[PDB]
Design a binder for this molecule. Structure first.
Ligand SMILES: CC[C@@]1(c2ccccc2)C2=C(CC(C)(C)CC2=O)Nc2n[nH]cc21
Length: 340
């Protein structure tokens, strides 16, 4: 069975074309709407199709956001199109399919009582920081950074941020809902009900992923709204008066970072963690600063290879958009051996 529709490319000029797909199977049902997998008849490539009922009253936030984005580490919007019998219009987004995710892989290692090799931790986290450096540069905050939303090709080690259904252009001045992100990854501002939060919530979240990958399980598996802060405090100790005020306007000592992770955990991984998982939002590294961190130096080694022996994926092909927030870091990030 073959399905043919008139779809507008996601990035590229706004002129529709006949697009044809087959082998359509439901592999999802969510907040957004339904997700299908399918095969494009031209290329034979695999794709995800998210179908969402859209009132023609409203413009769709996710679509508006996805059209702005082109990056090696972000799931591409290939096409979009509409479909229908009560005068219901459905928006279909047609996206890169990627077979696995960081959740699934991390779970295989955990269910076999093992650690994911630090090299993949470097690769994945590095590429996660790029994807966030790039989206924050438009003032788009993901608001749902977690391992289930990190697509992963196991052969190439290419990581791709997906699911922008919670994402949003942040506008200084306009309040934003506080009960956002999954709990375990939720920044403490948000727990405290802040409505004036920054894209740095994604960085706290990314810090939670890093730690999870080092530990083999989520670092802050809290109970509720407010117990989630208790779990945080178990590790970071009680925040000081200033730290609270910087987040938004019960006493335990800070458990030393070193003693959180199993021993023989690289000290620079723990250093990075401690600079992401900060109470004070502004005290957290920028995504770009985080890519610059010493933890990722092995990637800037010119001999660095995948375990399976192949070349690393694209790590340095930075754009000016992407370098926006601090261009002098280009000197550290693009290392000598790769220019022309
Ligand atoms: C098909 C949709 C999916 C996804 C959707 C939302 C978050 C993460 C991934 C997804 C997979 C493989 C999967 C993890 C087995 C199932 C699945 O939900 N790969 C994808 N590529 N593009 C979108 C996807």
């Amino acid at each position: 069975k073959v399905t043919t529709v008139v779809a507008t490319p996601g990035q590229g000029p706004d002129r529709p074309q006949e697009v044809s797909y087959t082998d359509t199977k439901v592999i999802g049902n969510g907040s957004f709407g339904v997700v299908y997998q399918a095969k494009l008849c031209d290329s034979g490539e695999l794709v995800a199709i998210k179908k969402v009922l859209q009132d023609k009253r409203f413009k769709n936030r996710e679509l508006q956001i996805m059209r702005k984005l082109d990056h090696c580490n972000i799931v591409r919007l290939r096409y979009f199109f509409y479909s229908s019998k009560k005068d219901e219009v459905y928006l279909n987004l047609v996206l890169d399919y990627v077979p696995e995710t960081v959740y699934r892989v991390a779970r295989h290692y955990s269910r076999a009582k093992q650690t994911l090799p630090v090299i993949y931790v470097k690769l994945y986290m590095y590429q996660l920081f790029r994807s966030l450096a790039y989206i924050h540069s438009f003032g788009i905050c993901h608001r749902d950074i977690k391992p289930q939303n990190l697509l992963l090709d196991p052969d190439t080690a290419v990581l791709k941020l997906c699911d922008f259904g919670s994402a949003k252009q942040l506008v200084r001045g306009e309040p934003n809902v506080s009960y956002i992100c999954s709990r375990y990854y939720r920044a403490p501002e948000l727990i405290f009900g802040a409505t004036d939060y920054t894209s740095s919530i994604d960085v706290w979240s990314a810090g939670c992923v890093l730690a999870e990958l080092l530990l083999g399980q989520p670092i802050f598996p809290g109970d509720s709204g407010v117990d989630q802060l208790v779990e945080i405090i178990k590790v970071l100790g009680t925040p000081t008066r200033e730290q609270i005020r910087e987040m938004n306007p019960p006493q335990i000592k800070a458990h030393p970072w070193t003693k959180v992770f199993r021993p023989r955990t690289p000290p620079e991984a723990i250093a990075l963690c401690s600079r992401l998982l900060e109470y004070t939002p502004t005290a957290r590294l920028t995504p770009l600063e985080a890519c610059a961190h010493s933890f990722f130096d092995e990637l800037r080694d010119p001999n660095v290879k995948l375990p399976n022996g192949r070349d690393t994926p694209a790590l340095f092909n930075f754009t000016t958009q992407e370098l926006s927030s601090n261009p002098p870091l280009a000197t550290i990030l693009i290392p000598p051996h790769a220019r022309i």
